[PDB]
Write a structure and sequence with these properties.
Multicyclic peptide, 1 helix, monomeric, disulfide, biosynthetic protein
Length: about 25
């Protein structure tokens, strides 16, 4: 799993998971 970053606290992730917004593959 990709460790959650304190960068995702914004509607820009579209309510994704941490690994999906902070670890896009």
């Amino acid at each position: 799993g990709c460790p959650p970053c304190l960068a995702l606290f914004s509607p820009s992730c579209e309510e994704l998971s941490i690994q999906e917004c902070c670890c896009g593959w």
